[PDB]
């Protein structure tokens, strides 16, 4: 098995000593191929890049989700919520069983009005810009997703479009997330009561609810079919914090990368815009109209192919096994799935992997199993997938309906890395088509 440069007792660690470790890992994957070993003090893992090896890794009888160091740091505030819990923890299966149906495609009909509420606020903000102004894309997309998850999650309004200093909860959460990633002594005091700012607000809202079909309502009314137990108030709080953590920046990034790819590819933009104009015939889009935005959905999947915004997930071997008939693994050995490399597997996608061509997704069932995994794998895959895609499709569709866009700076893609991926600095100008935008 190949391995990049080691640095004594530092091992490969110094190689991640950069702002952009995943893109660095992609270059290593370019050099070393489909699998390479990567070591740090106390650690070892194997990065997989090919559909061939990744399909085996996705076999749930053989491998299960691993809590990476990043997830263990996030667990200090996300607790035993779905995202940061072991599959074998009682609370994982319990919250999973309870929440699954509330995250189905069917369930999206119930969140649609609230999603529309925030989407309309975004579009009006842009309708109301003067000629001398431009849009900060990922910044506005993050306002949108945070507010949407807050509203659909626990019927709470962060009112991010009424501020440029975020609601104190957002500031604390963002601070906490950033601290947890930087760990990979005043920081410690700040971390502790950012945690406290988060728990305080969420606990309060839960307590107030005690004395509407959103999520929180589902969680207060849910019983796990296996045990017959409901979730306790502490876990509910962790789940709420979890939806925000896992959902806000992944989804914001997707919207940002899609708009980036659209303005860099005017022919696709025009085709996407034509669909939006034909489909979204009402001042407020309906749930069914969003489902008819087929090409918009393809644009989104092709953005996730090139830059999956949660670009790596970790697995461990349940038992001794041999990977791909050539790499023996022991129980507990770790693997990392490098999603952006998987999505550039020429043997699956053809040689033009770097090109933005949404038409690749014209026939989704033509895509081999485990070739496309922006939402992770199996029972530990993203529970928010339908929610994320419905939000992004609704919002992108509305953007395309209501504005023409100008890449006025000729933006140079600069991909910032945290827990997630984002096109940092991406800005555009939006000229309104002056089309009625209505009462929800
Ligand atoms: C485009 C947007 C999104 C992407 C690309 C994404 C990606 C992912 C990935 C890759 C995982 C697996 C992590 C791992 O295996 O360690 C995951 C898990 C999860 N995500 Fe998403 N996510 C997105 C949006 C959302 C949203 C909007 C929500 C909630 C509203 C959400 C909630 C969760 C939860 C609760 C888990 C843990 C599920 C479990 O293990 O039971 N995500 N996500």
Between vectors from CA 201 to CA 198 and to CA 206, what angle results, nearest 5°?
A: 120
Which region holds residue 14: left if phi is over 0, alpha if psi is between -120 and 50, else beta? alpha
d(CA 79, CA 86): 11
Taking alpha carbons only, the member of 364, 335, 379 closest to residue 53 is: 335
Taking alpha carbons only, the member of 240, 258, 290, 292 closest to residue 112 is: 290
H or E element in which residue 358 lies: none
Pairing of strands 334-338, 403-406: unpaired
CA distances from 423 to 123, 132, 252, 293, 414 (A): 20, 23, 10, 24, 6
Counting from 1 in the atom list of ligand 1, the atom nearest the Cα of 153 is 30
Q: Distance from the CA of 6 to the center of ligand 1, in angstroms? A: 33
| Tally of residues, the chain | 440
Say if residue 207 is exposed, middle or buried (CB neighbours under 10 Å; 0-12, 13-18, 19+). exposed
| C-beta neighbour count of 130 within 10 angstroms | 5
Counting from 1 in the atom list of ligand 1, the atom nearest the Cα of 392 is 1
Taking alpha carbons only, the member of 179, 205, 207 closest to residue 192 is: 179
HSE-up of residue 304 (Cα within 13 Å, Cβ side): 24
The angstrom resolution of this structure is 2.1
Query: For the chain, after which residues does the C atom lie more than 2.5 Å from the next written residue's N, i.e. where is it broken?
Result: 184, 211
- Best residue for ligand 1 mutational test, from 246, 255, 297, 299 (most atoms within 8 Å of Cβ): 246
Backbone angles phi, psi at 44, to 5 degrees: -150, 140
Pocket flag, ligand 1, residue 340 (CB < 6 Å): no
Asked if 248 and 419 count as a contact pair (C-beta separation under 8 A), the reply is no
DSSP 138-185: HHHHHHHHHHHHHHHHHS----GGG-SS--HHHHHHHHHHHHHHHT--
Asked if 240 and 210 count as a contact pair (C-beta separation under 8 A), the reply is no
List, in sequence order, every residue forming a beta bridge with 44; answer none if it has no partner: 39
Residue nearest to atom 43 of ligand 1 (CA): 382
d(CA 181, CA 66): 17
DSSP helix/strand/coil, 136: strand
Taking alpha carbons only, the member of 110, 244, 94 closest to residue 166 is: 244
H or E element in which residue 130 lies: none
Helices within 211-351 (DSSP H only): 215-221, 233-264, 266-279, 287-291, 294-306, 339-342, 346-349
DSSP helix/strand/coil, 337: strand
Taking alpha carbons only, the member of 126, 371, 137 closest to residue 254 is: 137
d(CA 145, CA 245): 11
Say if residue 439 is exposed, middle or buried (CB neighbours under 10 Å; 0-12, 13-18, 19+). exposed
d(CA 371, CA 170): 35
d(CA 19, CA 424): 12
Say if residue 230 is exposed, middle or buried (CB neighbours under 10 Å; 0-12, 13-18, 19+). middle
- Best residue for ligand 1 mutational test, from 311, 382, 383, 388 (most atoms within 8 Å of Cβ): 382
H or E element in which residue 56 lies: helix 51-57
d(CA 129, CA 122): 11
CA distances from 335 to 104, 196, 227, 313, 341 (A): 29, 34, 32, 8, 14
Pocket flag, ligand 1, residue 247 (CB < 6 Å): yes
Q: Distance from the CA of 2 to the center of ligand 1, in angstroms? A: 31
d(CA 340, CA 200): 37
Please, what's the b/e burial string for 316-325 (b: 16 or more CB within 10 A of its CB; e: otherwise)?
A: bbeeebebee
Widest pairwise Cα distance in the chain: 64
Please, what's the b/e burial string for 262-279 (b: 16 or more CB within 10 A of its CB; e: otherwise)?
A: bbebeebbebbbebbeeb
Pocket flag, ligand 1, residue 382 (CB < 6 Å): yes
Catalytically annotated residues: 250, 375, 382
DSSP 291-327: HT-HHHHHHHHHHHHH--SS-EEEEEESS-EEETTTE
d(CA 184, CA 438): 46
Asked if 35 and 327 count as a contact pair (C-beta separation under 8 A), the reply is yes
Domains along the sequence of the chain with CATH: 1-440 (1.10.630.10)
Please, what's the b/e burial string for 388-413 (b: 16 or more CB within 10 A of its CB; e: otherwise)?
A: bbbbbbbbbbbbbbbbebebeeebee
DSSP helix/strand/coil, 416: strand
């Amino acid at each position: 098995m190949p391995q990049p440069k080691t640095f004594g007792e530092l091992k490969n660690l110094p190689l991640l000593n950069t702002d952009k470790p995943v893109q660095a890992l992609m270059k290593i994957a370019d050099e070393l191929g489909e699998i390479f070993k990567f070591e740090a003090p106390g650690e070892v893992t194997r990065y997989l890049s090919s559909q061939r090896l990744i399909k085996e890794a996705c076999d749930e009888s053989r491998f299960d989700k691993n809590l990476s160091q990043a997830l263990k740091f996030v667990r200090d505030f996300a607790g035993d919520g779905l995202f940061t819990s072991w599959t074998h923890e009682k609370n994982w299966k319990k919250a999973h069983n309870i929440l699954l149906p509330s995250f189905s495609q069917q369930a999206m009909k119930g969140y649609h009005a609230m999603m529309v509420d925030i989407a309309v606020q975004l579009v009006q903000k842009w309708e109301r810009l003067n000629a001398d102004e431009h849009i900060e894309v990922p910044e506005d997309m993050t306002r949108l997703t945070l507010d949407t998850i807050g509203l659909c999650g626990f019927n709470y309004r962060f009112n991010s479009f009424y501020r440029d200093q975020p609601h104190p909860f957002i500031t604390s959460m963002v601070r906490a997330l950033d601290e947890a990633m930087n760990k990979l002594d005043e920081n410690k005091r700040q971390f502790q009561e950012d945690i406290k700012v988060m728990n305080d607000l969420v606990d309060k809202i839960i307590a107030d609810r005690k004395a509407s079909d959103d999520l929180l309502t589902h969680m207060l009314n849910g019983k796990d079919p296996e045990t017959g137990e409901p979730l306790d108030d502490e876990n509910i709080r962790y789940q709420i914090i979890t939806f925000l953590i896992a959902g806000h920046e992944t989804t914001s990034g997707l919207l940002s990368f899609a708009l980036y790819f659209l303005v860099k590819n005017p022919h696709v933009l025009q085709k996407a815009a034509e669909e939006a104009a034909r489909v979204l015939v009402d001042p407020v889009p309906s749930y069914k109209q969003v489902k008819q935005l087929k090409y918009v959905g393809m644009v989104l999947n092709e953005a996730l192919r090139l830059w999956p915004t949660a670009p790596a997930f970790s697995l461990y071997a349940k038992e001794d096994t041999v990977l791909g008939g050539e790499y023996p693994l022991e129980k507990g050995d770790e693997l990392m799935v490098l999603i952006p490399q998987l999505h550039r597997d020429k043997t699956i996608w053809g040689d033009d992997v770097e090109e933005f061509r949404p038409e690749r997704f014209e026939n989704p069932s033509a895509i081999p199993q485990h070739a496309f995994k922006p939402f992770g794998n199996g029972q530990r895959a993203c529970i928010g997938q339908q929610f994320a895609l419905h939000e992004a499709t609704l919002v992108l569709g509305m953007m395309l309906k209501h504005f023409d866009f100008e890449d006025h700076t000729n933006y140079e893609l600069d991909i910032k890395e945290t827990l997630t991926l984002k096109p940092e600095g991406f800005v555009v100008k939006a000229k309104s088509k002056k089309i009625p935008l209505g009462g929800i």
